Design a protein around this ligand. Sequence first.
Ligand SMILES: Cc1cc2nc3c(=O)[nH]c(=O)nc-3n(C[C@H](O)[C@H](O)[C@H](O)COP(=O)(O)O)c2cc1C
Ligand SMILES: Cc1cc2nc3c(=O)[nH]c(=O)nc-3n(C[C@H](O)[C@H](O)[C@H](O)COP(=O)(O)O)c2cc1C
Lengths: 354, 354
Amino acid sequence: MQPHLFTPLTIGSVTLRNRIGMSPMCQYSAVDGFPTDWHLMHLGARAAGGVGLIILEATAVSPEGRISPFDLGIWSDDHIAALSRIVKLIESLGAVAGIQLAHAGRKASVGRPWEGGKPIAPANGGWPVVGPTAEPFAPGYPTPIPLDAAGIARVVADFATATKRARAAGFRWIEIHAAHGYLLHNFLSPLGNDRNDEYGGDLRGRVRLLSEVTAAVRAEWPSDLPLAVRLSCSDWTPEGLTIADTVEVARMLREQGVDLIDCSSGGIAPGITIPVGEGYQVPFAAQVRREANIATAAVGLITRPEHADAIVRNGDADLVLLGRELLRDPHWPLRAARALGHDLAPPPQYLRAW
Amino acid sequence: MQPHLFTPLTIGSVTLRNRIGMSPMCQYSAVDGFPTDWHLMHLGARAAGGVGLIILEATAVSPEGRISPFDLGIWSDDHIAALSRIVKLIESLGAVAGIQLAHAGRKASVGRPWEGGKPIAPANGGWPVVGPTAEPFAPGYPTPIPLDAAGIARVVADFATATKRARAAGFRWIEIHAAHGYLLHNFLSPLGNDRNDEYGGDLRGRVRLLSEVTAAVRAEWPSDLPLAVRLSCSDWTPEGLTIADTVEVARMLREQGVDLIDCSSGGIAPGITIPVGEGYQVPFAAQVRREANIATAAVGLITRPEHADAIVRNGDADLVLLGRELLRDPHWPLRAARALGHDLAPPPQYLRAW
Ligand SMILES: Cc1cc2nc3c(=O)[nH]c(=O)nc-3n(C[C@H](O)[C@H](O)[C@H](O)COP(=O)(O)O)c2cc1C
Ligand SMILES: Cc1cc2nc3c(=O)[nH]c(=O)nc-3n(C[C@H](O)[C@H](O)[C@H](O)COP(=O)(O)O)c2cc1C
């Protein structure tokens, strides 16, 4: 009589068949924000693998908000068609389709990870980036234009429009990317802010932008459908965001009608030694969930089925997200099920294999 | 000097990157012979997973030749567009796109395996079947209208047009399905085929259909592209086909220009006890390679990386085809490379996971 890895989960009118999600993972394979056949196959395989929730990569609410020129985008109505096609593949295979709205902020305009991931200058078809202050992310990175009032309203509107498009594309779950040194986290974290205005200083100020985005997003997204935020729970130095801070943000987000905190960390700056290891971020998921009375997703080097189960049974999170493990093994849910002794049918096309 | 599982294979203008092929596997997921997003993801995924050669399922050269109403088709020019799209995805991931042309013949007009695979009547969307004699396959199956002068050269033409179509879609490997109880095998096997024409009785006779089909295909198939034929090598019964016969058939197909025999078995009639087990068809692949001096593929309950490798190292076969292993694990070649100590990188999108 406790929740396990293969217990459904209901928020609003959306029921995940189990507690396994595919974590948002950029593919750097879009053209002008448009997906290719790559995306259909990549996301499809996991939905056929048996995960209950596919969350699409960081999808840029605007061109300047992309990590790379190859980022999936949602800044035009033209983006709706190919995304809904992806939604239909995913849902025919019994998973729920979700999407991560993103803005890379001062970390935008870089090359693909597998090409060294170096900043691309505006001469080579980069673009000027934005942020809370003109403080570059690292040596060699561009000097961001600090957002003023007009730039801030633009972002909120951009998230708001993106939300409409996601709805039209048939997504039944949306996550706001407010982690990994990107625009929202950059505002939230003391390490990147020097802003003395209402969008910095105190925690109440530093959270203002995430809060305006959340409200704009939430207002466009039917109360009926799950909304998530992904946070960088800790900056992993004493002078940055701590879990305590995160808890207070989660509490405020809950009040704004967010259904789930997806609990990540890192990214605000380079050179921060982060204690990586199996389930190293689960404790953040545990704390947020207890203390902010909100559902959480746990993530980071979760690869073993019994570990995933323990996370759900121990009430440390509601959702277990797999990144790399699902890249290695899109059929992991099916193996998880047999390892734990739960019932999961493969695609009918594959019955004669199992 | 001599090869292992990850050694390239050249035939004409086509270089397979390793010795691992995906065995043709019917998906029962087409409408009027057209594929869906199911196929693109299903086939793309195994190419993403690093197999050298993707053989598409049994693709019907005519409507009547389909196993099920839901079979892939290549009887119409309409079918070119969608299949080339499948080919471009496959080729973009570094694998070679192949296709198996098929005619279910007497076993034609049945439902999906997971829907009881029971015959479907003409009143109910079924179609009258065709083949060597008027004898049904088993209790319950329709009555095959025997093929005449006319019927025969329609089948031969069909295989030939299909072949033109496959070239147009960009397939660079073609296999003729002359196994599993289907039209060509049905004519080749004494069991259940009592024909007494020049298309029956003697081996010289029983093989005529396959040889003409072979000739037709070869003529349309450019000479720099490999051609394979899958055979049932044994009927597993005393009075049926034997490795001795298959060896003779192979020797004949080598002289017709066929580049490889894909060595399967079974399917002529029900009630034949088949001694299934790991590598149970591999001695057939060995013997055909030994005595007919022709390249071969092995297939049948091969799952282990070292066994697949041992098959190639020993010269039992040139190519190892995996069916069910790849349904279960599209990424098998990546795991098999790691276990045997060969370099095989995953798609760049996935490098962070390996
Ligand atoms: C290729 C790749 C792409 C990623 N893309 C995103 C992304 O678009 N958005 C995001 O919030 N996190 C992204 N991440 C981080 C993961 O979503 C996830 O939080 C973390 O890697 C979980 O660890 P795991 O990969 O060990 O499961 C990505 C990670 C990888 C390896
Ligand atoms: C779902 C499924 C569909 C298949 N469809 C075909 C087919 O279209 N053509 C064919 O020649 N063999 C077909 N086969 C047989 C396999 O290609 C293969 O030769 C045999 O299963 C080899 O053993 P393996 O699956 O253990 O590798 C199919 C097998 C399965 C399980």
